[PDB]
DNA sequence: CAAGCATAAAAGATCTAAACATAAAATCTGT
DNA sequence: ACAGATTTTATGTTTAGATCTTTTATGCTTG
């Protein structure tokens, strides 16, 4: 068989028996493979220890967030409500990702059953009810250690069956995705469970957008019923700015003065953070980790972060660093300007703590503050609150005075950071396709050895050459005229000469003598290229019964 | 209809799959020396085929074996039921005698009615008015 | 923990396979320490790729623990629940890769649907497996929401070498430019059946002809189970034509067709086995009259 | 331009095959 | 070898996916 024609077929490669002691490392010797292996190993171990140090604090912050939100929602769930048992209390979690384990407190006289429902697991009202009753029965029987049909009467008979009171808490995982007709019908159905005087219900709506859509979609009577007890709770990772600050401070401490943050890098962090709110902290952690690993990867001097290896400077290191612009503008010379820790991080931490303890200001972005301090306009960020006017005297910061920060910094000047996490996907495709010269390297050393040393240079790759005309084409394109133009742009005699260049095959030379051999090989190339465009989505075809016209989908830029 | 046949030729009670394999093995491997001929009247074959197209093939193929001594008398409404259901190749590789019944004419129906009343037409009866 | 994606013009199938099979697996096997790490390569350009079979392979290779009865939930999807249980289990295992799941053409015809994308999204969170994928469509990033992009945790990389994609174009016709029946998958079946075996071709012709007869007995419709051919009936027909003598040979040679999705075997409601071809009647007739009929 | 004229695609009726599910009789396994 | 463990026949119950058919949102098109 042909394995390429298969699907999802496992392959067990035969690893060579040849092996070494410590050649197996992703890090490669920099400076044209001149650095020693000990430097690479030290870089690897320092990267691992620093990554562990950062991620431990990140995990602590994340766990703190989860614990705090769970405790707050559990406290709001009971809140010592004195309201009469004639309505069910509702909690709208504003903009909450459906990833939380709402814990229900154990009560001696009341079961507390968390029933979780999702849009995929709720096609209609009857299945909502059957799933809810099955979860209720299973949880109650597991807690308590014949059968009952799955309907609302299980709630009616609960006091008789298990000799205990009930408290069911409905957690709708994605309340925006469920079609609100069935959700409204299910709420109205649950309303019928208030004639028992031994069952209390609690609804939790994991809303993502706002309450405007809930008001618009739900029936007025249902909104009136919900309004008797509702609690708008705003739970989100992006609200209050009190959690991104902790992670950024953790990163700042895990780099300490050992590393420096470039102004453009923090500007990019802020820009990419401003464009996403539903999932913000994870994106920030990804960006920081990628920048850190890239900096330890493509920078050779990261082995010299700690002072102990400063003496390990060699002739190649000094020769390379001699071209540092800071050195031109300005062993023992380097260390006396390296061990000087940057006071910017300590000053920023002190300022943040000072404003967050007694100045009664909390809604601020530590990333924004750090970026502003890096620029140097800290007054322009501290004057917005209009409350630290008498405290600005002691909050002044001495301007940036540092040297040799190019070698120890986190920045994106080669564009890898932006093109590896948030690349301009379509724009990159069009940039690569329009200017194919910079994608395919041009070589002339071995053009004599190759069989096509005269045709490769003159012409262009078929797909990009077709894309040139396609961009220069009109909105609606006749296939015939497009092929005519493509063939006219195609050199005539050179194609025939290339065909004649192979004497091994016989069918090719047999077809070569045919007068329209060029006119049909060009057509074959055109069908191949148009198929590739259709697969890539550049072009589309209208009604296939006509198939004489095509429409351009994507435009360059 | 499989298991019934088995239950009527073997006295045992088997499920439909086991009955299929049992009947096939009895019609294929048991020698003609130790078998008794079976006549099966597959009445209303129209309802047996439906989506399955299995009953009719099994019953018209079990008669192909030389070991099997079976005379399957299938009866149906549509004359073209086999050639349509089994296919021309199968209905050709199985040679079965086809018979078509035409509705009675008026003379034939009159004869049927008259024959059914031969003992009562123009007869004397003693009747009591009480 | 970064799942890796390759995007750009040209075919990255050969390049990505060269990267994963020859370089990634031996190197990671050396670094973990012996045997090489298994490499599940998943052809996404095939419209016959099914997520059930992919997860069957992943659970045959990785062999995760079974899910308890309570964890099955009320009729919930077993694949996604098993994957979430796998995530819970693998959140504590040591962080060493035990599988690399190559995904060629992640934005293909049968691999772009939301179900398999959700499966891959939940599967990629597992640190112990590596998700290297390739994309071709311009609007491919449209397939991933915020949650799916987070779970993928992609690191986009540009690869553009203008390769002609010989393998990708195989599964679809080119004379009609591919505008019709692009996701049918019948062209790949024709290509694989062109030179497979004379006896396999003959029995496939018998099965196809029986399916057309059943369709005629029953407008272009799909070849569903109600129209398929019974396994016992097929064995009898093959024995009458000296193709496959017994059950064992027929099943052994039919497993090859089943694994390549040219045919499917299921069980009816009554328990009768059924073998059927999932191709459209017009596609079946074209396949019969273009390659089968030439003998 | 609208009407006419045509094909096309949305909304849903109608249905099936598959995944998920339970259960009673008969078979296959160890002491 | 006797009761438990597994299998085989036989349904019921939801989810995911299919094609037919009807209606109506698109184009084609003179002034």
Q: Per residue, what are the HEC states of A81-113? A: CCCCCCCCEEEEECCCCCCCCCCCCCCCCEEEE
CB burial string C36-72: b at 16+ within 10 A, e below? bbbbbbbbbbbbbbebeebbebbeebbeeeeeeeeee
Residues C145 and C38 in one domain: yes
Domain with C255 in it = 178-295
Cβ distance C74 to A425 less than 8 Å, yes or no, reads: no
Nearest to B63, CA basis, from B19, B27, B100 = B27
- How far apart are the C-alpha atoms of A141 and A148, rounded to whole Å? 12
Confirm or deny that B83 is annotated as ligand binding: no
DSSP reduced 3-state for A448: coil
After which residues does chain A show a gap where C to N exceeds 2.5 Å?
A: 145, 330
Distance (Å, rounded) from C-alpha A501 to C-alpha A518? 14
Q: Which residue, C166, C15, C183, C21, is CA-closest to A4?
A: C166
Please state whether strand D lies within 7 Å of residue A543 at its CB atom. yes
- Test C272 with B85 for CB contact under 8 angstroms: no
Chain center to CA of A481: 44
CB C86 within 8 A of CB C150: no
C-alpha distances out from residue B95 to A338, A491, B83, B88, B89, Å:
102, 69, 12, 12, 11
The verdict on a CB contact (< 8 Å) between A423 and C158 is yes
Do residues A207 and A96 lie in contact, with contact meaning Cβ atoms separated by under 8 Å?
yes
Please, are residues A155 and A195 in contact by the beta-carbon 8 Å criterion?
A: no
Q: Is B116's Cβ below 8 Å from some Cβ in C?
A: no
| β-strands C4-7, C129-135 pairing | parallel
End-to-end CA distance of chain A: 44
Say whether the CB atom of C77 is under 7 angstroms from strand E. yes
The Cα–Cα gap between A202 and A348 comes to 45
C149 and C219 housed in the same domain: no
- Looking at the fold, whether C1 and C23 belong to one and the same domain comes out as yes
- C-facing residues of A in 138-177 (CB < 8 A) are 138, 142
Same domain for C147 and C103, yes or no, is: yes
Cα B124 from Cα B21, distance rounded (Å): 62
Nearest nucleotide over every DNA/RNA strand to the C75 CA, judged by C1': D20
Is residue C6 a contact partner of residue C140, using CB atoms and an 8 Å limit? no
Sign of CA dihedral A454, A457, A458, A464: positive
For the record, the structure tokens of A237 come out as: 């990772």
**CA–CA gap between residue A398 and residue A418 (Å, rounded):** 32
Give which of C60, C67, C100 is closest to C81, Cα–Cα. C67
Cα separation of C278 and C226, whole Å?
12
List the one residue out of A197, A155, A158, A345 whose CA is nearest residue A266.
A345
Question: Both C160 and C275 in a single domain?
Answer: no
Of the candidates B19, B85, B75, the residue with the CA atom closest to the CA atom of residue B51: B85
Structure tokens at A44: 């690897």
> What is the C-alpha to C-alpha distance for residues C147 and C233, in angstroms, rounded to an integer?
50
At A26, list the tokens.
């992703």
Tell me how far apart the terminal alpha carbons of chain B are, to the nearest angstrom: 54
Sign for the pseudo-dihedral over CA of A336, A341, A342, A344: negative
**Same-domain status, C158 and C182:** no
CA-to-CA distance for C49 and C38, rounded, in angstroms? 20
Cβ proximity of A398 and A276 under 8 Å: no
Compute CA A67 distance to the chain's CA centroid, rounded to the nearest angstrom. 24
C-alpha dihedral over C279, C283, C287, C290, to 10 degrees? Answer: -170
C133: which strand partners? C5, C103
Distance C220 CA to E21 C1' (A): 15
Cβ pair C271:B61 closer than 8 A = no
Tell me: do C260 and C183 sit in the same domain. yes
Three-state secondary structure string covering chain B: CHHHHHHCCCCCCCCHHHHHHHHHHHHHCCCHHHCCCEEEEECCHHHHHCCCCCHHHHHHHCCCCCCCCEEEEECCCCCCHHHHHHCHHHHHHCCCCCCCCCCCCHHHHHHHHHHHCCCCCCCCCCCCCC
| C217/B53 Cβ within 8 A | yes
What DSSP character marks residue A4?
G
Q: What is the 3-state secondary structure (H, E, C) of A492-537?
A: CHHHHHHHHCCCCCCHHHHHHCCCCHHHHHHHHHHHHHHHHHHHHC
Measured distance CA(A367)–CA(A263) in Å, rounded? 11
Task: Report chain D positions within 7 A of protein CB atoms.
Answer: 7-9, 16-21
Which method, experimentally, gave rise to this model?
cryo-EM
- Cα B56 to Cα A311, B26, B51, B74: the distances in Å are 94, 18, 11, 9
Q: Rounded CA gap, B22 and B10, in Å? A: 10
Q: Is residue B44 part of an annotated ligand binding site?
A: yes
CB A296 within 8 A of CB A43: yes
Looking at C148, C177, C206, the residue that finishes a domain is: C177
How far is Cα of residue C26 from the mean position of the Cα atoms in its chain?
26
Which alpha helices (H) appear in A241-314, and where do they start and end?
244-255, 263-274, 281-298
Looking only at the bridges linking them, the beta strands covering A9-11 and C39-43 are antiparallel
> Do C185 and C147 share a structural domain?
no
Asked if residue B107 belongs to a known ligand binding site, the reply is no
- The answer on C52 and C26 residing in a single domain is yes
- Torsions phi, psi for A549 (to 5 deg): -135, 155
The structure tokens listed for B7 are 């239950």
Q: Does C242 touch chain A (CB under 8 A)?
A: no
Instruction: Kindly list the distances between the CA atom of residue A22 and the CA atoms of A26, A51, A301, A442, C31, in Å, as whole numbers in the listed order.
Output: 11, 21, 21, 37, 9
The distance of Cα A163 from the centroid of its chain, to the nearest Å, equals 50
Same domain (yes/no): C41, C155 = yes
Q: Which two tokens stand for residue A160?
A: 């008789």
Residues in chain A: 557
* Domains: count for chain C: 2
Residue with tokens 């109600």: C226
Q: From the Cβ of B18, is strand E under 7 Å away?
A: yes
Q: Rounded to 5 degrees, what angle do the CA atoms C75, C80, C82 make?
A: 90
Q: Of C213, C226, C230, which is closest to B54 when you measure between CB atoms?
A: C230
Q: Distance (Å, rounded) from C-alpha A120 to C-alpha A177? A: 9
Contact criterion met (CB below 8 Å) for A408 and A258: yes
CA–CA distances in Å: residue B73 to residues A555, C65, C233: 74, 57, 21
Q: Which residue of B has its CA nearest to C236?
A: B61
Residue at which a domain ends, from C177, C212, C232: C177
8 Å CB contact between C244 and C186: no
Instruction: Tell me the residue ranges of DSSP E strands in A125-249.
Output: 165-172, 199-205, 230-233
Q: Is C224 within 7 A of strand D by CB distance?
A: yes
Enumerate residues 6+ apart whose C-beta is below 8 A from C60. none
Do C230 and C85 sit in the same domain of this protein? no
Chain C interface, mutation test: which of B14, B27, B28, B87, most C Cβ atoms within 10 Å? B87
What letter would DSSP give residue A538?
A: S
Same domain, residue pair C83 and C124: yes
- CA at A125, C1' at D10: how many angstroms apart? 26
Domain boundary among C177, C212, C244: C177
């Amino acid at each position: 068989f042909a394995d390429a024609q298969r699907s999802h077929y496992t392959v067990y490669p035969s690893l060579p028996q040849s092996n070494k002691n410590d050649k197996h490392i992703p890090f490669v010797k920099l400076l044209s493979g001149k650095e020693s292996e000990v430097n690479v190993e030290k870089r690897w171990e320092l990267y691992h220890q620093l990554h562990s140090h950062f991620h431990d604090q990140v995990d602590h912050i994340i766990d703190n967030i989860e614990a705090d939100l769970k405790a707050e929602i559990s406290d709001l769930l009971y809140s010592e409500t004195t309201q009469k048992r004639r309505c069910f209390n509702t909690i709208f979690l504003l903009g909450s990702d459906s990833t939380t384990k709402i814990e229900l407190k154990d009560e001696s006289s009341r079961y507390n059953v968390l029933i979780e429902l999702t849009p995929k697991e709720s096609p209609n009202v009857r299945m909502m009810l059957r799933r809810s009753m099955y979860k209720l029965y299973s949880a109650a029987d597991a807690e308590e250690h014949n059968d009952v049909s799955y309907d609302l009467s299980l709630v009616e008979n609960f006091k008789r069956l298990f000799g205990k009171d009930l408290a069911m808490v409905f957690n709708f995982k994605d309340v925006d995705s469920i079609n609100f007709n069935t959700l409204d019908n299910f709420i109205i159905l649950l309303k019928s469970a208030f004639k028992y005087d031994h069952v209390k219900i609690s609804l939790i709506f994991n809303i993502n957008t706002n309450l405007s859509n809930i008001e618009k979609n739900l029936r007025q009577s249902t909104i009136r019923l919900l309004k008797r007890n509702y609690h708008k709770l705003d739970v989100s990772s992006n609200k209050g700015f009190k959690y991104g600050n902790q992670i950024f401070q953790s990163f700042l401490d895990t780099v300490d003065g050992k590393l420096n943050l470039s102004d453009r890098f923090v500007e990019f962090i802020l820009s990419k953070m401003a464009n996403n709110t539903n999932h913000n902290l994870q994106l920030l952690t990804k960006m920081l980790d990628y920048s850190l690993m890239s900096y330890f990867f493509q920078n050779a001097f990261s082995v010299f972060i700690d002072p102990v290896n400063v003496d390990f400077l060699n002739d190649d290191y000094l020769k390379i660093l001699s071209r540092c612009p800071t050195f031109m503008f300005f062993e023992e010379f380097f260390v006396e300007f390296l061990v000087r820790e940057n006071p910017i991080n300590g000053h920023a931490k002190f300022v943040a703590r000072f404003l967050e303890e007694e100045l009664n200001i909390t809604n601020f972005n530590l990333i924004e503050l750090y970026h502003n301090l890096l620029i140097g306009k800290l007054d322009s960020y501290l004057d917005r609150w209009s409350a630290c006017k008498e405290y600005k005297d002691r909050l002044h910061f001495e301007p940036i005075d540092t040297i040799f920060q190019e070698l120890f910094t986190l920045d994106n000047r080669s564009g890898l950071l932006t093109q590896s996490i948030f690349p301009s996907y379509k724009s990159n495709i069009e940039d690569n396709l329009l200017s194919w010269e910079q994608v395919l390297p041009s070589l002339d050393k071995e053009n004599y050895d190759t069989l096509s040393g005269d045709l490769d240079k003159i012409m262009a790759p078929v797909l990009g050459q077709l894309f040139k005309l396609y961009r220069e084409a009109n909105m609606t394109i006749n296939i015939y005229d497009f092929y005519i133009a493509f063939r006219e742009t195609l050199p005539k005699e050179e194609i025939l000469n290339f065909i004649r260049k192979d004497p091994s095959n016989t069918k090719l030379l047999e077809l070569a003598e045919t007068p329209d051999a060029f006119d049909k090989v060009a057509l074959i190339l055109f069908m191949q290229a148009i198929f590739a465009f259709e697969n890539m989505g550049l072009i589309k075809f209208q009604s296939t019964k006509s198939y004489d016209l095509v429409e351009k989908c994507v435009w360059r830029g | 209809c499989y298991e019934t046949l088995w239950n009527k030729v073997s006295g045992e009670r088997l499920t439909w799959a086991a009955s299929m394999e049992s009947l096939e093995f009895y019609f294929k491997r048991v020698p003609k020396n130790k078998k008794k001929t079976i006549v099966v009247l597959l009445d209303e074959l129209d309802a047996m085929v439906t989506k399955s197209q299995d009953i009719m093939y099994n019953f018209f193929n079990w008669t192909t074996y030389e070991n099997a001594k079976l005379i399957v008398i299938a009866v149906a409404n549509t004359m073209d039921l086999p050639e349509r259901q089994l296919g021309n190749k199968i209905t050709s590789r199985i040679g079965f005698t086809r018979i078509m019944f035409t509705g009675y004419t008026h003379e034939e129906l009159k004869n049927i009615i008259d024959l059914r009343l031969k003992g009562l037409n123009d007869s004397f009866f003693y009747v009591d008015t009480k | 923990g970064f799942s890796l994606l390759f995007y750009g013009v040209g075919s990255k199938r050969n390049f990505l396979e060269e990267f994963a099979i020859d370089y990634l697996s031996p190197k990671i096997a050396y670094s973990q320490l012996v045997n090489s790490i298994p490499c599940l390569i998943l052809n996404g350009y095939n419209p016959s790729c099914n997520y059930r079979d992919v997860f069957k392979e992943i659970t045959d290779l990785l062999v995760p623990a079974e899910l308890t009865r309570s964890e099955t939930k009320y009729w919930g999807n077993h694949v996604i629940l098993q994957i979430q249980k796998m995530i819970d289990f693998y959140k504590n295992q040591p962080l060493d890769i035990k599988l690399i799941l190559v995904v060629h053409n992640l934005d293909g015809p049968s691999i772009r649907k939301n179900t398999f994308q959700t499966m891959l999204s939940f599967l990629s969170v597992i640190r112990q497996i590596a998700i290297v994928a390739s994309t071709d469509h311009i609007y491919a990033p449209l397939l991933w929401d915020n949650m799916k992009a987070q779970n993928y945790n992609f690191v986009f990389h540009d690869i553009s070498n203008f390769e002609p994609s010989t393998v990708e174009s195989t599964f679809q016709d080119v004379m009609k430019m591919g505008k019709s029946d692009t996701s049918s998958g019948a062209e790949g079946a024709k290509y694989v059946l062109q030179s497979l075996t004379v006896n396999s071709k003959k029995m496939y012709k018998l099965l196809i002809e029986t399916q057309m007869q059943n369709m005629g007995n029953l407008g272009p419709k799909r070849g569903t189970q109600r129209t398929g051919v019974e396994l016992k009936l097929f064995n009898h027909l093959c024995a009458a034509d000296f193709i496959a003598s017994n059950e064992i040979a027929l099943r052994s040679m039919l497993r090859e067709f089943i694994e390549h999705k040219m045919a499917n075997i299921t069980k009816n409601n009554s328990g009768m086995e059924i073998i059927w071809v999932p191709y459209t009647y017009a596609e079946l007739e074209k396949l019969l009259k273009t390659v089968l009929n030439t003998l």
